[PDB]
Amino acid sequence: QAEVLHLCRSLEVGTVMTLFYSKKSQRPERKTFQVKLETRQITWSRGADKIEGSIDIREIKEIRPGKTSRDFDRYQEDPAFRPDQSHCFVILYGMEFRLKTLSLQATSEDEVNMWIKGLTWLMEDTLQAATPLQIERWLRKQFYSVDRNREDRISAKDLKNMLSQVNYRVPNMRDITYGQFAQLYRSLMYSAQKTMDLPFLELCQVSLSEFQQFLLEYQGELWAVDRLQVQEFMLSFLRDPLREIEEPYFFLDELVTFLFSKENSVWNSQLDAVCPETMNNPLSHYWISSSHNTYLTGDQFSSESSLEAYARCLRMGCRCIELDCWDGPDGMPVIYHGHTLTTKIKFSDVLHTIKEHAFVASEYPVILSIEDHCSIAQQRNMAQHFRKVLGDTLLTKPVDIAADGLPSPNQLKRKILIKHKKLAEGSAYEEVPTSVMYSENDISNSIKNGILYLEDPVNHEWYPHYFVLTSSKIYYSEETSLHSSEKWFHGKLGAGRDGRHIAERLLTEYCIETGAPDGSFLVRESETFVGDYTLSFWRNGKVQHCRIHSRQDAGTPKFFLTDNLVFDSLYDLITHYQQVPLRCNEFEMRLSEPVPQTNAHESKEWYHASLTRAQAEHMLMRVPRDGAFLVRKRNEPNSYAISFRAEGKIKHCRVQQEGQTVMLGNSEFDSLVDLISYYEKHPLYRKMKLRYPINEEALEKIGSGSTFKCAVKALFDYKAQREDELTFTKSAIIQNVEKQDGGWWRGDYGGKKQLWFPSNYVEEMINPAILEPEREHLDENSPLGDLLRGVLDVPACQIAIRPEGKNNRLFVFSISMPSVAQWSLDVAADSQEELQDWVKKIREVAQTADKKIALELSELVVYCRPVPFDEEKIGTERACYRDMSSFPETKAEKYVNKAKGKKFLQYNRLQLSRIYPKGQRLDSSNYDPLPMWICGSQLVALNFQTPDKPMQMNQALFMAGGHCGYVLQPSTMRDEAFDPFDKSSLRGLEPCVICIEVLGARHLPKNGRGIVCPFVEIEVAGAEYDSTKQKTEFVVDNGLNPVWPAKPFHFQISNPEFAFLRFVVYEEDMFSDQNFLAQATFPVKGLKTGYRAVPLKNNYSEDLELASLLIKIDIFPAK
Ligand SMILES: O=P(O)(O)O[C@@H]1[C@H](O)[C@H](O)[C@@H](OP(=O)(O)O)[C@H](OP(=O)(O)O)[C@H]1O
Ligand SMILES: [Ca+2]
Ligand SMILES: [Ca+2]
């Protein structure tokens, strides 16, 4: 305890260490680091002072000693950066699958040791800190993020902006210190929610006998019949040692804050411990947390394989992980997804990662699913490395030779098992006996896979697409992954008094609307003295003007106010008079705030001062890509619209300007220019960013880039003026046209070949390949899955290499189709060798019109022996509990339906089944695990890197047991009558009736710049007969503390042993779409009753800071 207070006190002082950026362009550099205790952040002051970096300690997942990091690996042979493991350590932090890393280089080995032990305690105390203290640190984090920390007092509009950044919009405007800021927060959170229906509930206070009456009458906490128990419960909440030495008391607002806190969670934390009693059934009786292609960080085709993903999965409590082993460059296999562009990591590194992390989250057994493409020698090296590195951790022999069933999880604690094909006794080949020429159309069975490039027909940039060639088709995806600068210089505003009036308007509106100081100013070009300038500044509610003289005399420039000092640049003049007063119109004034320009949009490619809705729509409908956009002024003042194309249709939204800001819905920006720049970087509508500014120039040049056998149409007659020129008549189609800049193209017409003609005497015929493909009847299950954009029928295509490339791409081929004149796609590869490979294989596809296993590795396979699935062995003496079978999603669906589900249940009570996603989910999306689980499948393998609903259900299921990774399947479903498609199979199992009312929410996260308009979807997920969804209405412009109207919900669950209660918070955005904000999913068996908090998670299932709902939940039958 004293050691902890000593430790924390030392790091708030600090330490200096070198930083290895997770960015390549950057070169390592040093800074000082410290732990602001009042907020629990790791801040790194750049140099002993200014604060330039920060990490929230609550996001730290691992503090790892050594140089084990990607950053470190980027400089491991550079001798300038070959540090020492003793001097290096790594913080892994974040709330997504791919954790962020802080890779640091210290000097002492007790320096690193204190930090590591400091953060370890800090991490644990921050995470379990009582909620009033977490709120208190959040309030400080918001505070130390504006002008406060300096003046120690923030403005009143700083508050408006900070509140909007935390999802709260005050109706209209209404300096403050932290104590007053925290007072305002607590008062706002309570006032905004005093309307919630709370029968139990002018800052009154609730006492001990009152809180005890609550816990008992409403919360069903029977322990609270002991008063001293509640006493501590209330003191475990407040955590103020003052006010403690008297009877505990809550204020009303502290009671409401309690109702929202993790201390009031709907989730019974008693189910967070392992129940060792439930860990004694055969392995086949457990749901086992399982990962598919564990090495991958992203999609299945081109993402990075990472050691870090193994560590993340095992630390999320995953127990069955997957290794895809291929022959490596040095006799040691590599791991990556075969036949793709995913990066390769080394088998040896993976094993050490697995060793280091397999039992941090759980003592329970780990299963390595080994997809093996290695030669016999590399299989031997694997077998040798498994045995050496894992030692007694590896399972090498059965637990019970006379058993008739798999061993229990308890019997396999701290064991790692190998799942791998096994030789028949005395054979050199697996007894493999399944004959299936139903070759799945996926990237495994394709002819060639790769990334190739396609010119965008609108901006003429090359973009990468995934290409897949099969034996008859090419599938391609959607695209993959001086003074004039100064704010105070406004240039020429007008040519006469119009410019003076514009300057007076700009300066006046700025000063009035912002309460700007005297001396606020702008500079413009002089309307009266050419080459000179005019300074305008605010003084006594009036605008003052003075001439700034300019002289190019004797070579160098000379700027000066009349009768005043001479300066070399306009910047120097202004910078000087912002520090000491000028004299102007007999007045003394120091320049202060620069007046910003407000109409920078007026010269942008996308801006149209005069344009109707109908004209904008006609313009954008000429553009065959989504993200075509323009901004138009509207007929009413201070009003604009964005017009943009999405899903082949045109949409519009109004942008209103209110003073020095602009608004789009509730999203506030500084200017139209800043607004558009924001939505070029972030999506505006669904996943659509603003990409192409549409004006006359852009429209003219659309689809103009073809090269292969191009035709053009003569617009006029042309008589050859030289012997190398073509002669032709109006409307003539000139063929095979070679296009070049400089005004002259080359083509065939009238018998003459490749003669020159004027470029602007023709229009280029349309290349239909530039148009969007019809995507409505496109194959849902191509090798590309949901990423598919287009299909080409190879026998109807022709291919030709362009030897000179095009558009700064050296390696280009052209696909055409003889029966569709002028249809052509130009396609670039990254290398001449890649180009040659694609061309030869495509052309070959067109001209068509029609495993040994090392004993040393085999010996390590004790259980989890893969055999072809034999439905007829189910229930007979021929079923071997050591044999297992794997099921690709689509095959598994054939067994988890009404017809075969009960027999799949029978199989799974004795033997393991592994389910994994279909090959076509190249995007690493996940299938629904519940229909697999409810038929007793144990190894339901999901892409852990993907933040979708299947992974949210996975982490929810394994919440029972605290993510130990094994959950005992309930006895009712290991009954032989249990049928997931027949609730009559359950017999008289008591059902469960849930009544819920969503009362309010706090600290909801944002989805962009606006303020969310949230609604809550409540779901029960189990068998089909139990599954249903309900939702609340959305509330307007509030994520910080919304409350919802009355809408009582009822759910009835016939099988509460396989049932999940799921809460999803959505926002209704301005386009009437519904966007995920947060979620919490629970097994129904762990639900408490009463007025309960619902602590909210992100889509990766990480705890959000403070975010929660308050519900009223009643469960029947009564406990
Ligand atoms: O890596 P991909 O492309 O997703 O390929 C499938 C997937 O990874 C499965 O997890 C794997 O299951 P099993 O090892 O459990 O069988 C299967 O192996 P298989 O070809 O040996 O059946 C692979 O085909
Ligand atoms: Ca695999
Ligand atoms: Ca990791």
Numbering used by the authors: 19 to 192, 207 to 233, 245 to 524, 544 to 768, 791 to 934, 947 to 1215
What text does the study give?
PLC enzymes catalyze the hydrolysis of inositol lipids, mainly phosphatidylinositol 4,5-bisphosphate (PIP2) to second messengers inositol 1,4,5-trisphosphate (IP3) and diacylglycerol. The catalytic activity in all PLCs is encapsulated within the TIM (triose-phosphate isomerase) barrel fold structure, which, in most isoforms, together with a PH domain, C2 domain, and EF hands, forms a common PLC core. PLCγ enzymes are characterized by an array of domains, referred to as “γ-specific array (γSA)” or as “regulatory region,” encompassing the sPH, nSH2, cSH2, and SH3 domains. Recent structural insights have revealed PLCγ1 in its autoinhibited state, which is characterized by an inhibitory interface between the catalytic PLC core domains and the regulatory γSA.
The geometry of the active site is largely conserved compared to the structure of the related PLCδ1—coordination of phosphate 1 of IP3 involves H335, H380, and Ca2+, the position 4 and 5 phosphates engage in electrostatic interactions, including interaction of the position 4 phosphate with K462 and R1010, and the 2-hydroxyl group is ligated to Ca2+ (12). Despite the presence of excess IP3 in the crystallization buffer, IP3 binding to the nPH domain was not observed. This suggests that unlike PLCδ1, the nPH of PLCγ1 lacks a canonical PIP2 binding site. Similarly, Ca2+ binding to the C2 domain was not observed. First, there are hydrophobic, electrostatic, and hydrogen bonded contacts between the sPH and the TIM barrel, centered on the hydrophobic ridge near the entrance to the active site. A second interface is formed between the C2 and cSH2 domains. M1166 and F1167, which form the hydrophobic tip of a loop on the C2 domain, bury into a hydrophobic pocket formed by F706, L746, and Y747 on the cSH2 domain. There is additionally a weak interaction between the EF-hand and nSH2 domains, stabilized by a single hydrogen bond between K175 and T576, which is positioned slightly differently from the previous structure. The PLCγ1 nPH is more akin to the ArhGAP9 PH domain, which points clusters of basic residues outward toward the membrane, and has a noncanonical PIP binding pocket between the β1-β2 and β5-β6 loops. This analysis reconciles our findings that the nPH is critical for liposome binding and catalytic activity and yet has no IP3 binding site detected in the crystal structure. The PIP2 headgroup observed in the simulations, however, is not as deep in the active site as observed for IP3 in the structure.
